[model samples]
Target chain A: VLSGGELDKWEKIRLRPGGKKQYKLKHIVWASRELERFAVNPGLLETSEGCRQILGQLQPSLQTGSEELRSLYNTIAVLYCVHQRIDVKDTKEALDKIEEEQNKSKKKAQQAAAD
Target chain B: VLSGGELDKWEKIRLRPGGKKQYKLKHIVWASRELERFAVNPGLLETSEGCRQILGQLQPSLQTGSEELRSLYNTIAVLYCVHQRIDVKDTKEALDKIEEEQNKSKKKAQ
Candidate 1:
């Protein structure tokens, strides 16, 4: 009998801030923090084959998002990759090789024109 | 007796991912989002005089933290101020005026 009255009191009180309608806010907050952690320590990607494959592509692919958002994502990716001890020198060296090739081609064209 | 065995089953199961030690991660996530929301909608500060005063000082004070953290904080502050239609032009002008004054002082010294 008293417990029935307690149940009535529970029904009258709000269970959440801004009620159930605002529960999404809690999820959004959780996801943002999860992403932040993922950015810093991405080793969890290795736990699943699919996750590993997705992250592998993310490193090489041109990530699309808002400028600031993309910048933050890249920062997180770099931080995570560094923490994972992933060899990033190859990516840097590949870009350098492309630039060197382009410069060499430009020099060759310039020499031909001069001749 | 059946209910008692059910309680035992609940105890045997993992309650959370990574268990109790990682519960702070949930708080961090929540706080980050809360701060993000607070950054965009800072009108809540007006509800409490103390909150208002602290936020007022925050605008002028040199906020110290990691560069990315500071950047994000300033972004939130600017977003919230803009949403509230707070006259940020004055703050911008103040910074500009300081820059101008520094330039003038340097010219005079030179």
Candidate 2:
């Protein structure tokens, strides 16, 4: 799902504005999946230091990456905190952010999930 | 205020679990300060892609960094999003995240 689909969809995303939103959403979804997968059995991220190691490994991918990639990067940061749970702590500007997400009408929640 | 203080305070932070909290706190403070400074005027981060550049540049520092550094890293991720405004989304797992961030009592709130 990261890339490759109905006729070069990933390339289309990087070049277009609206496509960028879908792109970022895919990244967050990918990060969530990886976080869960790693939680069960891990690799370069098995230790807190390993967390940083993978972060560094993954860092390079962002060079060609647009701001849309931030969610994926953010997830890496959060994941690092988890391993460090050998550990962590946000608030009100966040509350404002809360309402922002809450009222957002979806483009395709039902159809996308239909199977 | 990033480091260098009363007799080896920076060194003291890395080795001890308790000291790590204070150290991480300092990273968050530093991250907040830089975010503000960069907002007014910028550097390699002046452009959206520049944001990623700096992120990559700063990536190696984490090798010696601790989990406590996550907030600072999280800040970087958010900062990048601000640039991508060229645009974004998240929801209720996030609302739960909001609650997670909200109800928690602070170790220090001053």
Candidate 3:
């Protein structure tokens, strides 16, 4: 959808605006809020598993070219995961660890060069 | 259904863990990525007029109960605007200006 220049424009817009991409931000915010309005049941038990299995049985029809239903599924999946309290901080920590290791490696190389 | 305590648990999991909500994040990321595959044309002229006119004609049915088509339109709208380089930078810059104005006013009040 974006031209190379158009993407650049969006990048500049995002930065100048202090890294806020409003459309997606609003979309996600609204989706999350709507998520709160919906019903999500996450159990750390077999009944939850059975419910998910039933959902899985209906997946193809729901997701394959039925975007209304697909959006519903997407909404449900996101709400369910949010409801289940899936640990996502690992993603952030993982990125931080990578940055830290890179910094450490650079420092070690700099020290080695001085030696 | 988040119990009052369950919500607290989820919040604690989200924040104390430092904010990496994967589910919605991934959905949005995929959505944006998929945004690239479609075709969109934006013109500040008349030839493109008919195309849009035709599309407008279909809007009601496409959006009413046709989720598939609604998503298609969403994707198309994003692509078309991106194609046109509609200066979404203004969106950001607009917010920043508001913030700056708010700060300036608050400082003046001080």
Candidate 4:
């Protein structure tokens, strides 16, 4: 039962505040700090319980996370991949091809204009 | 469970393919279509079991998804919000403040 957002009316209205959104941000901020720490401490992600605890807080947040929150969560995820040393060989290849395809499109557009 | 990578060798080498990464993408692509359909049918998110089934495939992919897959998952998520009609009232506000801060940072950086 964790959570998950808001906009401009929140700017200078800090009287400590009282709302589920703030509390949820509190959890996410705290959780990210833990993730940062996990980066330095390799053993945590290696352990099932440790990973589970972190994901428990995160998944609920992602369920209703704001746009920025989703990006942060994705960063956390990539960090997990980094620690696991996930093989990027093919992804790199795929990405390279995708990039080339993109570049090809760019040149194809340029050629059409010159003609 | 289901999962969740790779680079250049993946191109020009499709003999139908044989890898976890491709399969993972297949799942994500299929899952996103389901989410897209959900947008038209509002009742899925309203039901817990429907929501659970959708999340089950998504969360694992998110665990170790490619960069693109993560964004796709996030899109699925926001769509869920749309279906639920989650009040963007505040999130829109929060996003507004975040944008201001970002703009401030832009000038601040400059």
Candidate 5:
């Protein structure tokens, strides 16, 4: 489904002007596929450097400060749940946990700034 | 000079049909830069894997069997001279050496 959207966006880019909409969509789809595959495989993600590269790729989209970014982040959060092997029964908790992780990092940075 | 040709080809692709012409030119320019950089720095090319990747990227153009391919190969031969710190005084010898190397490799593959 996500890959389909990527193809759709590519078609639009090819046929039309592509602009920011097409670029943003492409980034989202790329992150979706990458993170989804990482969730399933987790082999390359085992390495710190590999995870850093993945995060670096995802960072630009996350910094886009748009709805697409939020949606992509949410997708990544779900994929993270999968990576952790969390049971489907705890879906809400898994999502909440991921959100908490984001918040934890943000708060830590904020505290450091205040210091 | 070579980089200008790349930009020109990109413009052609962006404007006109571009077709094989644009693709071939793009490959040539890319190889030109990569090999030129390798010739100077030789850092990444020092790694077998890095050299392998560079060769892999060049393989398609080398296989095109067109004038552009030959031109690109000749240019690469010159760059190889630069890489080896060969003096300009031996330009003919350098080119001949490169051709000889290519021939040797071809015979080995056969």
Candidate 6:
């Protein structure tokens, strides 16, 4: 998912004038999947720093000096922030505990016989 | 890897007790890798909402009621923000252009 090719889908989201609502809905759906998967706390997605890798792929040839791009980027930035679970301070802590307990539990429990 | 199992390595990072300097270095390396990859503009990583999935895995299993968790989470949060290039104003514009030209070029030849 961190691959640079992922942006192909995002770039198709036409936010220009008179565009259909599908873009927003598509974005929401995409965002929802990300939220459900990476959200360590509630509204943020914490993972292997997938964002940095993703954006880095595009920084080489673009001119980031325009207002339109700035605004769009900001919009995406905010969405990404909220998506990455960057909103809540307890996110990492919760993550740590979950890992700890899961590790403990996995080590403690053998295969169950419910089959 | 976005799998929940990745946290196993992070959990062992002893942020509380007296330990070596490797933890911070490890974090820096991890953050650097993310930045190099996700930062479309600079300093911010813009992936597929990996943070949300990562944290959600922890939310149900942890209490999140103490200041330690809050503070730690806040610190990590800030680091992640910086890593993702959230500080740049024109970051996305730069990114879009890069993609447009790249796509155009890739398609132009074909």
Q: Which stretches of candidate 5 lie over 4 Å from their true place?
A: A1-24, A28-115, B1-60, B87-95, B102-110
For model 3, the local distance difference test gives: 0.35
For candidate 2, give the lDDT of residue A14. Answer: 33
TM-score-best of 1 and 2: 2
Runs in model 4 with CA error above 4 Å? Answer: A1-52, A89-115, B1-110
Please state the CAPRI-style docking class of candidate 4: incorrect
Model 4 TM-score, 2 decimals: 0.22
Estimate how well candidate 2 is docked, as a DockQ score.
0.05
Q: What residue pairs are clashing in model 1?
A: none
DockQ in order: 0.01, 0.05, 0.02, 0.03, 0.02, 0.04
Better of 3 and 5 by lDDT: 5
Residue B17 error for model 6, in Å? Answer: 5.0
Model 5 lDDT, residue A52, Cα: 40
Q: How does each model score on TM-score?
A: 0.19, 0.23, 0.20, 0.22, 0.27, 0.20
Interface RMSD score of each model: 11.7, 8.4, 10.9, 8.2, 16.7, 8.7
Superposed by TM-score, candidate 5 places the C-alpha of residue B19 at a distance from the truth, in angstroms, of: 31
| Model 2 alpha-carbon drift over 4 Å, by segment | A1-29, A32-42, A60-64, A90-115, B1-110
Tens-digit lDDT track of model 1 for B1-110: 11333223323322133243211223323324544342322333332232233344344434665555443334333233333333233233323443464489799996
Q: What lDDT does the true structure give each of the candidates?
A: 0.36, 0.41, 0.35, 0.39, 0.44, 0.36
lDDT of 5 by residue, A46-97 (tens): 3434434454555543422234344444444433444454332222454567
Report the lDDT of model 3 for residue B66: 61
lDDT of 4 by residue, A11-102 (tens): 21221224222122343354456556435332444433454445545566554343444444443333233333332222233233434645
lDDT of 5 by residue, B34-73 (tens): 4443232223233434433444445556755566555444
Better of 1 and 4 by lDDT: 4
Name the top lDDT candidate: 5
